[PDB]
Write an enzyme that holds these catalytic residues in place. Structure first.
Site, short mmCIF file in Angstrom:
data_model
loop_
_atom_site.label_atom_id
_atom_site.label_comp_id
_atom_site.label_asym_id
_atom_site.label_seq_id
_atom_site.Cartn_x
_atom_site.Cartn_y
_atom_site.Cartn_z
N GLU A 192 -10.90 -6.23 -5.56
CA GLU A 192 -10.86 -7.27 -4.53
C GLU A 192 -12.15 -7.25 -3.73
OE1 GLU A 192 -7.39 -7.24 -2.09
OE2 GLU A 192 -8.39 -8.22 -0.40
N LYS B 195 -15.04 -8.34 -0.81
CA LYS B 195 -15.10 -8.81 0.57
C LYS B 195 -16.52 -8.57 1.05
CE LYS B 195 -12.73 -8.74 5.09
NZ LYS B 195 -11.94 -7.93 6.09
N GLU C 279 -9.83 -13.32 -2.80
CA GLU C 279 -9.07 -13.82 -1.66
C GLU C 279 -9.80 -15.01 -1.05
OE1 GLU C 279 -8.33 -12.22 2.83
OE2 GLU C 279 -7.27 -11.07 1.31
N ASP D 127 -7.24 -14.44 8.08
CA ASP D 127 -5.97 -14.30 7.37
C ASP D 127 -4.91 -15.25 7.92
OD1 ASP D 127 -7.04 -12.26 5.69
OD2 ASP D 127 -6.28 -10.68 7.01
N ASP E 74 -5.30 -13.72 -4.06
CA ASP E 74 -4.78 -13.63 -2.70
C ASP E 74 -5.02 -14.94 -1.97
OD1 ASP E 74 -3.95 -11.00 -3.10
OD2 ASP E 74 -5.41 -10.12 -1.73
N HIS F 124 -12.04 -14.42 1.99
CA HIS F 124 -13.16 -13.50 1.80
C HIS F 124 -14.40 -14.21 1.27
CE1 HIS F 124 -10.51 -9.63 1.66
NE2 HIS F 124 -10.44 -10.28 2.81
N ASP G 283 2.06 1.84 3.43
CA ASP G 283 3.07 0.94 3.98
C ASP G 283 4.48 1.45 3.70
OD1 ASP G 283 0.91 -0.78 4.55
OD2 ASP G 283 1.24 -1.93 2.70
N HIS H 103 0.85 -1.18 0.00
CA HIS H 103 0.00 0.00 0.00
C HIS H 103 0.88 1.24 0.00
CE1 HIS H 103 -2.61 -3.07 1.91
NE2 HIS H 103 -3.59 -2.43 1.31
N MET I 199 2.61 -5.90 -7.95
CA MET I 199 1.29 -5.39 -7.64
C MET I 199 1.42 -4.28 -6.61
SD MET I 199 -1.22 -5.35 -5.06
CE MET I 199 -1.30 -6.89 -4.14
N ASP J 182 -1.84 -12.93 1.25
CA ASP J 182 -2.34 -11.85 2.09
C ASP J 182 -2.71 -12.54 3.39
OD1 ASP J 182 -3.34 -9.61 3.25
OD2 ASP J 182 -4.98 -9.31 1.83
N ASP K 40 -12.46 -12.04 9.57
CA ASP K 40 -11.45 -12.34 8.56
C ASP K 40 -10.15 -12.76 9.27
OD1 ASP K 40 -10.08 -12.35 5.97
OD2 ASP K 40 -9.68 -10.19 6.19
#
Ligand SMILES: [Mg+2]
Ligand SMILES: [Mg+2]
Ligand SMILES: [Mg+2]
Ligand SMILES: [Mg+2]
Ligand SMILES: [Mg+2]
Ligand SMILES: [Mg+2]
Ligand SMILES: [Mg+2]
Ligand SMILES: [Mg+2]
Lengths: 385, 385, 385, 385
Positions: A179, A181, A215, A255, A243, A218, A55, A52, A86, A285, A253
């Site tokens: 993406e 969700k 993902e 992960d 993902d 998700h 980030d 991101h 990406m 992810d 979620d």
């Protein structure tokens, strides 16, 4: 089962970099320098990293600090050979996005969201990103009166259409991946599944520029079959990115690392990805649980790649087994691949064997032999053949 | 709150006609003559009825018995003034369909499914049906090896494309509506949500002939927001028909009477249907619980219509309240309806108020006032204003 | 991986005997003579069979036909050596039970339910059953006004208390096992989970006569961790019987063969059952999918046992691995087994190392090493060590 | 519909004080001085407030600062007349609790958790708390090998037993209430439902000191019927405290204001609480959405109380309606309240009207009339009678 960069395994900076801050608890790990993550991931055999904007460049950085952070990051890429396939925009952390980015009720926030995105697209192209992901995590509602969903879809289309106008006016070779969700952090999120995103894309001015970034966890938060959804995306020609992670059913979620959660769904996913020849990044992810220290972080990341490679070997052994190939014929998978009526409508209407003289009781008594096939798949997964 | 045929309330024959046969129990009610259902529904104020081919003409009937059943049925329509706006095919009850209709692995079953459908389309046009619904209840899988989903989507497209070739070659004025469902009776069903069906339709040869028939309880079996999904369908121009009922969360398909289950979702659904001017049938696909005798059947059916009409009055009172209209402005629903950047891309890029001089802290501190709005909606629903 | 009667694998007559009749479809298989099931199950290596009264003796049979059916059945047991460790009552199929058995609103139905149960307890003791299971499938409600749950729990306690009075007055050596289920066929069922049943048992007159019969798929229909629930039942000393099968998340009750559904949960379940020394039957309550013919029925039943045995070997290899044993010490499973304060309350209050001089930052920085442990478990399950 | 302190409405400090920090976003509101919350809640008509130790006294405070915070807080209580009926321990926020408090694998953390709890029990008694709540939010696991659940239940029992030894040795008049939750923040949490907590309590040394504190949204995260679970808790005599809020199905813990989420379940809950004469606090554990500013915080809190009072009036009108009372007799709720066999076992066995001469077909044909009853309840809720 050792990964090589040839395997195209990629990780988000925010994944191994997650400090453990959850809704009910403070961080359990210090922050990671993005340079340090790149080096540790290169050692583990990863192909590349994603980011991101926030980030890489802490929010509100001056132009000069911005340039320092990029040059430090680029140097770590050159030292390691790692790629950046990406990139994406953080339109969910800052309080200004509390009602969304592209579909916030306040018009001036929506314009700000677009400008923040366009700035990072420039940077992603500079670093060589092929795909630009959009996760509308704050686009949604907790209550029904708060958002007119038709108006919000108008705004969502307007945002994506302008983004496509920008990349084509700049002559950029980058494509967008939405993406989906279903929920969290909003009570319901717009475009909640792979299907809703594919439907939405067909209404954009330039559909060919947009695909999906589904993902694992998700779609499982809605109880859906993730390999089925990926097959529909491949069928539509829209699986641009994916993902990988783990999820234990319908709840928050999680992960988890890939291979955890629903193990048989992971097996059927790899089988599909490999037999269809998906050639994009195998992006993870995920979040190393906050019970872990930094040694556990790298063990969890290593495990993502190992589990993909074990499942790849098992699925390849399953499809190559002659006993499985005859089981597939016994269950008539070969007939599924054959056109129903290549002879055409009029031939179908006149074919008495299709209705007047069809023996429904004979057809109905034919067993599908699906359970023997599925036990062969189980034996293969478990290495019990 | 008394229904009139003007309200366009319709019921399936299989709804009030359901005998109570469930996975763990025998029937608790005798069968209903379709003539008797038409008369009792006309007395309750319904506008019309719908049918599966096998509801009206028992499976395997000779041409002569077929004609008797239709003429009896038509006479009840003429005696009552009831209409038949929609019809559909039973491709799920007979054992021959145990692996599906249009996507069965066996090619000869797929051809038989098409012929059985085409025969009923002729009959639906004769009776004046505007919409022909397809629920692929057996299209799916319990195990991953049993169905290649890309091949099955090829077969599914082939079936729907030939059906559209038939109606256009015959000059019929009828449109198709795909009804999604995530699971049950198969472990996972293909096209599991409104979004997956909308996506699929855009790949058909003649997309304009196909829309969706969403059902309240079906999207809720995946935990999705049903009014959000209906808004996306209206936005795409594809809400051709709708199935109203009740469902208490993620579990087996309950088919409770409309208004039972999630009451606030029903309120927001009616608000959306009425404000968008949906003008199709208000169809109830429900099951009077098997605890009930025939008096309870008609009480349950009556309740479907009553609950729609009470919610229609409450939603109309909510939107007409000046206090609500100022609350909507306070939450900036008016700004959501306004284009984000009608000034265009280049004006956006040069607008310093959109980024360089945007005060993010000022924007972030603005409350959305969504909770006061939602309590006004609650007070309205409850008649506490 | 071949089963022997020593493995104590048992099957219900209604499992391999299920004809495929589901909510949306007719039967796909003919009925099975119970004698034929006993012989085919003995050939596959099963230890025994179980039954509902109505599986063995068709409802409403005269005393004379009753005796014929039992003698035929007993002869098949003697010919094969198969046992009958468990039996149960059908209080859910006949329409008379549409509002429940022990908690029906109508008092005369409740008395009839008790008499029907007592009659079958006599027969189960004759055939040597050790455990008598009660699944209250119709005890529940679709609507809130229909059942006062406090009154219904009074009636439920009254039923179970009288059943315990009967077995003790007759000097029978048989114990009861309550089988929980959250929903289906009722909208919500009473005692919906293992925990609710354990709580309820402590209010019976003779708690020591009652335990639980949990089923894999049932707790997973509520999203719960089935091995966690089984551990609580073992901890309470109440795991009298267990039903093994597979389930893919929160949806209708699938009753897939054991090992299908959540594979890692099956691994952790077998690990728990084997390490705790559960010594009762390994009963399979499953349904061969209706896609199958009779050859697929026996393949599915065979697969139940095979999958248990493969998982037993993998879990035994996991716990015997010295590398796993040091990983367990690294994660402090040894310290979990140690009393927190065997020195007692007063010693705890005066222990300054427990509060005043406890270094919370040092303790907090210790990683739990849970991800490395879990990857060792994955490698073991997959046979990749 | 204006609340008075007589209505016994209470709020946690952490509720209206929640800053909006969620898994994906920073805080959107400044922190609230606990003195300011007490005054604003007293103005809204609340009866009292509750607290975690760490809400009132910031973690790691010296004895002297501790005393300041308490005296400031006590002064606000005296100025307003607000009470403190309940208190609890934060054993989930500090990183030291990342693997749990009472069931952490590390023994020294478990001892620290006990000392931190005992310190706050002293303070709660000083402030007049009647009930002390324990929410084991970190007691659980993300992976199966990480926690032996039998050992962890041993540790959990040991913790609660020592806590009961402390309160009785000190002569305190305070009782404990365990708060269940199925998941989040751990992947699965121990004692996941009301039933599992009730079962666990019966194994404590002093069961009479412990009850449950169930929360609306928590049982709904497992898809369970919250009014059914509350009825079982009342039936067992263990409903010591209750947490009211709203939840939209199986997903992350939303903590919406009470009345939002499942509206009909809220109606049936209030009906049960009021008819059973629950006399404890009506506590709201909720979160004003982070879209809101401080004016929206107080609007959301006000709405909790208003919605309880509207539902109380509707449920009271429902039970007082003579038409409803005859509907209740028509559905045989009166017969549910009558003993099944007060004549005793032997009279039951000899009663031919209970079996030999029971007309099952006559009983089975009786409709339960549940749908007419439920529509009367709907009309009442909606004020349409
Ligand atoms: Mg995720
Ligand atoms: Mg992602
Ligand atoms: Mg339905
Ligand atoms: Mg329908
Ligand atoms: Mg089951
Ligand atoms: Mg069972
Ligand atoms: Mg909560
Ligand atoms: Mg709470």
């Amino acid at each position: 089962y050792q990964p090589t960069p040839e395997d195209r395994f990629t990780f988000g900076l925010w994944t191994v970099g997650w400090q453990g801050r959850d809704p009910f608890g403070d961080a359990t790990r210090r922050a990671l320098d993005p340079v340090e993550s790149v080096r540790r991931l290169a050692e583990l055999g990863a192909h590349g990293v994603t980011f991101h904007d926030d980030d890489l460049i802490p929010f509100g950085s001056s132009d000069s600090e911005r340039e320092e952070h990029v040059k430090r990051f680029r140097q770590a890429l050159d030292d390691t050979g790692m790629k950046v396939p990406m990139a994406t925009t953080n339109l969910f952390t800052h309080p200004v996005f509390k009602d969304g980015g592209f579909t916030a009720n306040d018009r001036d926030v929506r314009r700000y969201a677009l400008r923040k995105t366009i700035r990072n697209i420039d940077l992603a192209v500079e670093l060589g990103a092929e795909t630009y992901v959009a996760w509308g995590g704050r686009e949604g509602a907790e209550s029904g009166g708060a958002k007119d969903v038709r108006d919000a879809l108008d705004r969502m289309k307007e945002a994506f259409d302008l983004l496509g106008e920008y990349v084509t006016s700049q002559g950029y070779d980058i494509r967008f991946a939405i993406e989906p969700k279903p929920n969290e952090p909003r009570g319901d999120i717009l475009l909640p599944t792979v299907g809703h995103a594919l439907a939405f894309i067909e209404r954009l001015e330039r559909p060919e520029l947009y695909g999906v970034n589904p993902e694992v966890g998700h779609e499982q938060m809605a109880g859906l079959n993730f390999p089925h959804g990926i097959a529909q995306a491949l069928w539509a020609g829209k699986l641009f990115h994916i993902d990988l992670n783990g999820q234990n059913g319908i709840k928050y979620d999680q992960d988890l690392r890939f291979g955890a959660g629903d193990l048989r769904a992971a097996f059927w996913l790899v089988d599909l990805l490999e037999s269809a020849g998906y050639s994009g990044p195998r992006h993870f992810d995920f979040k190393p649980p906050r019970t872990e220290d930094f040694d556990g972080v790298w063990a969890s990341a290593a495990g993502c790649m190992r589990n993909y490679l074990i499942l790849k070997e098992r699925a390849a052994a399953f499809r190559a087994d002659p006993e499985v190939q005859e089981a597939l014929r016994a269950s008539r998978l070969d007939e599924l691949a054959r056109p129903t009526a290549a002879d055409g409508l009029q031939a179908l209407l006149d074919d008495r064997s299709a209705f007047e003289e069809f023996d429904v009781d004979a057809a109905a008594a034919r067993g599908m032999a699906f359970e023997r096939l599925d036990q062969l798949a189980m034996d293969h997964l478990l290495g019990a053949r």
